[PDB]
Amino acid sequence: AFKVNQFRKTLRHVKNIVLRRKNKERSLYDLTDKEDNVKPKTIVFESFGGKNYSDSPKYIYEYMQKYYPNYRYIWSFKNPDKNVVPGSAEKVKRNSAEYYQAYSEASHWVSNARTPLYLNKKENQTYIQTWHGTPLKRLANDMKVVRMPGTTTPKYKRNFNRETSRWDYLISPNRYSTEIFRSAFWMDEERILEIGYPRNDVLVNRANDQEYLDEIRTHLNLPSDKKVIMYAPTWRDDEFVSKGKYLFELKIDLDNLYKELGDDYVILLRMAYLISNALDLSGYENFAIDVSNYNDVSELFLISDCLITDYSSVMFDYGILKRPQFFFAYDIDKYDKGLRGFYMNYMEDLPGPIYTEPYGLAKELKNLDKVQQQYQEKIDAFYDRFCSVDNGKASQYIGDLIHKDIKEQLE
Amino acid sequence: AFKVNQFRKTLRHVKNIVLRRKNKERSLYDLTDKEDNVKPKTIVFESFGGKNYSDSPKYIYEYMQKYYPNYRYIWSFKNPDKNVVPGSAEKVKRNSAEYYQAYSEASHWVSNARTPLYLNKKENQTYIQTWHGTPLKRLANDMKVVRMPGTTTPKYKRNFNRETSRWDYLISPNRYSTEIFRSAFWMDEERILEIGYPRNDVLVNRANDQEYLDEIRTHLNLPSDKKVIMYAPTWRDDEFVSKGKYLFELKIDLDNLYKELGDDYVILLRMAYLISNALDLSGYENFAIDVSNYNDVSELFLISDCLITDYSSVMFDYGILKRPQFFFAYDIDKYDKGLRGFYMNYMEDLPGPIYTEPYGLAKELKNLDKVQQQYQEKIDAFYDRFCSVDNGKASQYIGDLIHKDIKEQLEH
Amino acid sequence: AFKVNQFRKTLRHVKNIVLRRKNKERSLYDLTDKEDNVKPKTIVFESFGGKNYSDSPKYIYEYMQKYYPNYRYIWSFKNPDKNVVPGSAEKVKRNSAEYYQAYSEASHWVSNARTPLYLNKKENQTYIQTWHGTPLKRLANDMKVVRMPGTTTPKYKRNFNRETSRWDYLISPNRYSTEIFRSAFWMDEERILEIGYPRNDVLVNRANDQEYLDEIRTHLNLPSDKKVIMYAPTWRDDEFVSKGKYLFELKIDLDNLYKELGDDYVILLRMAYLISNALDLSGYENFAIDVSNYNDVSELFLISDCLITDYSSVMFDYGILKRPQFFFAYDIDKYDKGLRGFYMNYMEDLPGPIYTEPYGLAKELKNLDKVQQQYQEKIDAFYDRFCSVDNGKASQYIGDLIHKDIKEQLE
Amino acid sequence: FKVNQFRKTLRHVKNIVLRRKNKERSLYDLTDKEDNVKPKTIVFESFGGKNYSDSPKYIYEYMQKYYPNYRYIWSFKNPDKNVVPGSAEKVKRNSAEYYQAYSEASHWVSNARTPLYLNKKENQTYIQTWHGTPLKRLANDMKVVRMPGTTTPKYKRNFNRETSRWDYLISPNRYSTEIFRSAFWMDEERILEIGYPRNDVLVNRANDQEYLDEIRTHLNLPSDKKVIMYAPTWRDDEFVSKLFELKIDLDNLYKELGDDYVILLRMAYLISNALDLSGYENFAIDVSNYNDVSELFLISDCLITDYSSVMFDYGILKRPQFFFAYDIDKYDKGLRGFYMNYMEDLPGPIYTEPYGLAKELKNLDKVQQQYQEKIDAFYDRFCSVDNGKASQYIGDLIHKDIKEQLE
């Protein structure tokens, strides 16, 4: 009478219930997850595995809120109380009974990072995967070796693969990424929507919306007369030391930037969360504004006159605006010398100069116009390759597609 | 008080019974295994995860068959039928119900390699570990990376440490080794018995027993008029290609060795189980003798006039005989250039010459006595550092220790 | 070492879970129930094995609702949606996860009948048994033969003894009952609270509460000028015939009772659940009121000018009111001729006449004050033996015992 | 994965881990498939394994001669204390070997009930010889059974379960058949009226003077003396003091008959080792533990019994019987709790005092004429059926049965 798989689960759950394991919520879900639980107008959102309300899901959501308030919107979070969601969406805490109800019921899953393999994406449901940016470093399959603790390359890749096979829909911002995903994610071009990122929507539809460039600016208490510079270096293992209490000042040399640019500029510093609540910005008030904790990074872009980064997929997002970029790669030699661990030729076809010391960077920074002119060539070359595909309608395209998928399911 | 461990095993075992899983024998054992099971006069032996009747545990056991024949002797094998054990030992097949009774009951485990962590070594029993050679490559905790599929370096070292912590006694051949075990295996000097390897007993006790040497030689159908070169390279992953059906002839070049040394010598080829049954010694009959499957390596050392290896710990055992050794390291370049990946300075303090090419090896082999004087300096020095401790009396020291351990247990 | 009792339960539970047995809830309970589940201020109630909200456990629960609202009250039923409980108590259905949780946590059980042997009464827990009436017929240990199916006399006695051994306190109404309980129940005088029946409080406290008599009288649509007779015979197996679709009219002859008293009296029939829904009362309306399903038997006693019974322990409770009783023992012949199957001498020391034919009865029932005087002797003697204990503070004594018992534990 | 197999599976996990003794049984229950049956294996047991005796014996002895070729198995409580001739191997009850035997056999031969935890598959032919013509009513025909631990309905139920598995049931007479068809819930089609295999030697040997001689000197009996057998059934009433001499008055019998007779006492196993027979040496022989009872009847010139089914066996020899019913009042005054009319149609006199009994015993030949009538009426009602070829009939039937299975 009893099937073998149900049995294995039946025991697992007996063990979680009697030993008071916290995963009892999960095992129950495994036993009772039926293809019949799906409610065609329940859609579940989650971004970066629950840290945020943010990114492509946010916008795919905000659009679907203005055009179909009639559906049941659920968001998932690590700490639902510490997040704020506009509209009629209800929120669920990761790993609670509600969390699993939601994922079981939903006809659609919107997400921008991997969702856990312990969740059944039934053949009954559509998992739309937006991902979170054009790749610069190699990921998934294309990685060579991965000495990540607790997990080995083959196992890590087997698992990443089990997860992409669940992607009914994978978004792409460009053929560069489409070409890449196909190999890296074990995808079939059939399922890749080359429609651009919904989070990048507002880079197209608002680049000139002054009352809105002003909300952002006066939200951050930014000076009335000063142009904006964003700096966003990627995380580097290296630089962590001594409990993470007192850091050494940024290599970009802040005291310098204050001397050279303090009159004409202000610098939005966007660091990793560990450098940030370790950074003392005493006596840089109204010059360096810490911006690492700001929810929506696309808004930061809209108000920036240029973007200093190093090895980061954000250059591909900012490029939509065709503004100048500088690449402050002080540790470019420690990074393989001439590394092909990069899907692109970093040494040639990015839209700005590569600086290793931060002083000719600052000087150059004085006159943006000379840089915009000098590099207009490489900046447009960049815009056609990696940015020429966003409509401003990406949130629309996905949201509509959902809707469409859910009229059919309504027959 | 609810016993949360006992619960986890009753479930696991219910699972194995209902699903017809083969580990059902294992999970019963785990559920039911009490200290009260141990029979002070039961002793288990296993060598190389149950592949052989061989090595230290063989000798530790042969000694005991002769001086304490009244204890219950159980040997463990992957395939007991395909193994022949002298004396009174009963044999158990691994992962069979008897395998488990035998380890549950035994007051002493003897092994020369790792025994599985699913077996419970109660506070009640004594796990004596002999290991299987003086370390040259670095092992266990001393390793840097281990891209061994299925397991990550931390979780492999974790497990190893789990195993060594169960070693009540660990045998050692030399102060060199001891220093290393204490680190590589997480050992406390208290538990190390620097007494030499029981398997190396015959290398001392019988090295000049002519009649015994002759049983070994004629058991191997060797010429009478010819001296013996043994060749034992280690396993190389690199050299594997094409299903393991037709290897390329050994780098040592048999054809050349034949021309050069065919008149005075015969060469004993001791390879890995794979390079062996791919080899075609057609037309090297009575010169190249395949000897890969010969159960007792120590008997081979005894009849061997010199040894050729590369990076093997067998060089430390054969050193006991103060005979010549050549090191054909054809691929020394592809092993890190200058590799401290060894506990010793491989380029300097070993008992013979290092050859990267097999042709000047052959020549140098034509006159063993020159090599023996040329290197008597180094051969002796290598003996003082790695072989000085072997008594000949090592199966005795373990045999004794055990019996002495098991009178104590037959009183209070 | 190996905990064998636990092993036995783990196997049992594994068995129920895999086979989809309804008792899986029970066996989980047995495996996990532990002394530390007991919340000192949780108290379970149940009456007659979960049939009602009624009897002593009710009058205990209602008293603690007034003076000790702070505690957690749980009531147990077969069908909780079909029972109504005033106050703060939660209702658990029998044999359900919440029922077992309830008995696992409670510091005190209250019941008036036997509670199942599969519930563990930990040393931790105080089990109060109020029982449900002064014995007439002989019960438990004092029985001679019990040919009840599937179970032999020894095995029945063994299980009853198992139950009484967990009664931490047993209520008794009179020395006569104590004498008996002590033997029939294998009880220690020490554990017998001889305080009367809580369910019988109102017969002391409220006999004269003219406004309360009325709520009860108009609850039953009783005519105004008419006096009230209550007939309540015990169940007789012999009489059951024909699936229970049509009984031969009651031996008491309602047709006659109408002609004789249909002007002055109304008669309240309290019968067994099978005789009651087989009774045709066409044309006895406003004379014969079926009152079998009435929830509170004491309220009926209060408004009863006299009780007609036969071999029931109700004669004992109704005695507190010192009103007249008639014993219509039509079948006294069949019951042994001269049976000592009764703890008391039925033939001699009861508070009224033994009629074996219902015609003399009716006549006598015409003039009630003549009966009252004729027996005001036998009636007082009976009240001095069986009813002289109830101060109507019985519900209180128990509530305060519990409340005291659970102050001690809170330290 | 079946629900029945899962229940057994769990049971065995329990028995094995708790080292219960029924581990041997739960295993049997798990692995017992129809495929285990070996057509030429036959199991014998008599009285639940206390003996090598009775009908199963004679069926076995007969097949030991005409079919030495089959595998014969006998089941005992204490195999090391029983002597079995011929090829048969033996099994101890509730051992691995016992469940083997019973799973493997194509035929079970027994004379009393065999346990319900044993699986009688469609594959197997269970033959019940039972053990005697009923005088006390049994099984379904019982009124009340206050046997401790169990209830009348649950007892009749379990018995009905056992008889439902008797493929063949043996019967000594129409009178028994009548009673079996009702008392054991039996089909008349399944009853073989052939008489008792164990009575075979009462027909075939009664005049074998050399056999009679072995039996007689086996017991060290005197040569000039005739032989009386006394076989009073058991009475619960009479157990006391963890005894009092027999109500038959051995002293009197020794006085009145000691010079012509010798008296064989066949008692219940409990009165046997409470009896002191000092000073009756060579008059009263205790014969209560003698393995074979048909050999006793053979050498008995008469039988003194009371309420026992042995009168029906001994009848075959048309010899005088006596019925010392000293306590026939306690036994219900006039009880029809008997299938027959005791007070009438039995082959002998009902005595209630032992003294007129002793006198009548003096001259057997006069007893034998006085009663020739009633003795014949008795041989005709209850013993006419016995061929002396019963053992033969089963033996062959089994042989005849297992030539079929062999195709």
Ligand SMILES: O=C(O)CN(CCN(CC(=O)O)CC(=O)O)CC(=O)O
């Ligand atoms: O019978 C089990 O529940 C326990 N088993 C089986 C594995 N468990 C672990 C799990 O929860 O994933 C479950 C199982 O696979 O049935 C072994 C374990 O505890 O490590």
Ligand SMILES: O=C(O)CN(CCN(CC(=O)O)CC(=O)O)CC(=O)O
């Ligand atoms: O009843 C059974 O299913 C078997 N067990 C009981 C089954 N339970 C224990 C219990 O119900 O008493 C656990 C198990 O399935 O064995 C009794 C036996 O030995 O015949």
Ligand SMILES: [Cl-]
């Ligand atoms: Cl829906």
Ligand SMILES: [Cl-]
């Ligand atoms: Cl022992």
Ligand SMILES: [Cl-]
């Ligand atoms: Cl094998």
Ligand SMILES: [Cl-]
């Ligand atoms: Cl460990």
Ligand SMILES: [Cl-]
């Ligand atoms: Cl080797």
Ligand SMILES: [Cl-]
């Ligand atoms: Cl358990």
Ligand SMILES: [Cl-]
């Ligand atoms: Cl509490």
Ligand SMILES: [Cl-]
């Ligand atoms: Cl309900």
Ligand SMILES: [Cl-]
């Ligand atoms: Cl309610």
Ligand SMILES: [Cl-]
């Ligand atoms: Cl009562």
Ligand SMILES: [Cl-]
């Ligand atoms: Cl009526």
Ligand SMILES: [Cl-]
């Ligand atoms: Cl099934």
Ligand SMILES: [Cl-]
């Ligand atoms: Cl069983």
Ligand SMILES: [Cl-]
């Ligand atoms: Cl066969």
